[PDB]
Amino acid sequence: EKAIPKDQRATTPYMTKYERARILGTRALQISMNAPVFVDLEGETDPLRIAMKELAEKKIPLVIRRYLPDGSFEDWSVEELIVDL
Amino acid sequence: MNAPDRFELFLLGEGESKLKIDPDTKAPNAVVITFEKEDHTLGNLIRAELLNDRKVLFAAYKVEHPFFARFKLRIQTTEGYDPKDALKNACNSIINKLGALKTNFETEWNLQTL
């Protein structure tokens, strides 16, 4: 409880701009604080640019707890969420 | 208060070199020379002359921002013609034209009375 199951989840399969921006921020923070990089940083040194690469490569190990107005939620991994924008 | 020194218009700084010759990214046999501590006096003069050269495919200058006294010159030449050469040729032509002018004006001046 409360947790909605993985099957039967009506929220967008797509990641919101707000999700993306927060994910990019949280990751850029970790990168900038000497935490490990999960992708080949070929030529890059910018913590945001690195988080962006990590996102594009879907090697970002973070999950979004989507709250609904009743209090229930839906957990979606950065790996699963479609990144159109 | 935030205004830079007027000598910065004509005086080269530390690390600063006059010409910075870079190979053009897109076009073949084209080059891009950044002229430091120079303006329209030199830009428009070299550019106009480079055009008189039949083996010059393209020649155009620009001063990206007024605050800074520097200009960019892009030159393209025919196969086997190095632009650095088309530049030195253009430069030498200017010198010669100027020589004659100096001489001719000087001659004329010596003929006048007042």
Partner: protein, 133 residues
């Protein structure tokens, strides 16, 4: 490629519609009883008066970066006096057998009417206009 059209036209009207270097020309074929022509001409470069006989040719040769003429031995497909370069943009069929072509020579427009604009005038960035005498 080679020519795609050639005909001698007769100037109906010449209009400087609030323009002082450009003029819209109204022309008709000396041979064809239906073949029309409406064209914008730089009347400062090629002054055109009334009922002047004009050879109008549409070609596709003499993408690649422009090199200045600056070669005497360079010979272009003209002994002509006025040459333009444009793009095809519309092909309105003016009912039954009559077809019109739309060319824009850098915003100087052209409209040529007829029948035989067939396997010659296609939707092409290729378009050379050539005027004679």
């Amino acid at each position: 490629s080679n020519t795609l059209f050639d005909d001698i036209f007769q100037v109906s009207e010449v209009d400087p519609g609030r323009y002082n270097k450009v003029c819209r020309i109204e022309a008709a074929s000396t041979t064809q009883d239906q073949c029309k022509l409406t064209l914008d001409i730089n009347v400062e470069l090629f002054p055109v008066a009334a009922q002047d006989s004009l050879t109008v040719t549409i070609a596709s040769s003499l993408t690649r970066s422009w090199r200045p003429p600056q070669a005497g031995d360079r010979s272009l497909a003209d002994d002509y006096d006025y040459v333009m370069y444009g793009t095809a943009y519309k092909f309105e069929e003016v009912s039954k057998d009559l077809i019109a072509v739309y060319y824009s020579f850098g915003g100087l427009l052209m409209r040529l009417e007829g029948n035989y604009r067939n396997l010659n005038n296609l939707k092409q960035e290729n378009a050379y206009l050539l005027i004679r005498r």
